[PDB]
């Protein structure tokens, strides 16, 4: 069960109408979110509506991906996130499908924090799943 699945989006940019956060978590391969292109940070997460236990995500990246990138969990209250700790990261991302495992843990809101490009636009995913 994808508990990411049309739940609530925020992202630190879009490059383009039509590529909002949203799009990475509607189920459907063919929609992404794509950011603003550059060196900066980017980020997308997921309200996931109620604090679940969670252990797994599974990126679906289109082809300008983060090489490196953490997975990071919030349980902060209300809509609006400020804390958060990184689960997971990398700086050996190969793109395509990254299917992720980390301890199981309390969370509200899920954020994948890309740091590394692998190409010079921005980062995009068409999906974003999040897993007990």
Avoid at 91 to 110: E, L, S
């Amino acid at each position: 069960h994808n508990l990411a699945l049309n739940k609530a989006t925020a992202t630190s940019s879009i490059e383009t109408a039509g590529h909002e956060g949203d799009k990475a978590v509607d189920g459907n391969a063919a929609t992404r979110w794509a950011s603003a292109y550059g060196a900066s940070p980017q980020w997308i997460y997921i309200n996931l509506g109620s604090t679940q236990s969670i252990s797994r995500v599974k990126l679906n990246w289109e082809d300008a991906y983060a090489t490196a990138y953490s997975i990071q969990v919030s349980n902060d209250s209300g809509s609006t996130p400020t804390n958060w700790t990184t689960v997971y990261s990398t700086t050996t991302g190969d793109g395509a499908i990254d299917d992720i495992t980390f301890a199981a843990t309390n969370a509200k809101f899920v954020r994948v924090y890309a740091t590394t490009r692998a190409t010079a636009y921005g980062y995009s995913l068409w999906e974003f799943e999040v897993y007990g």
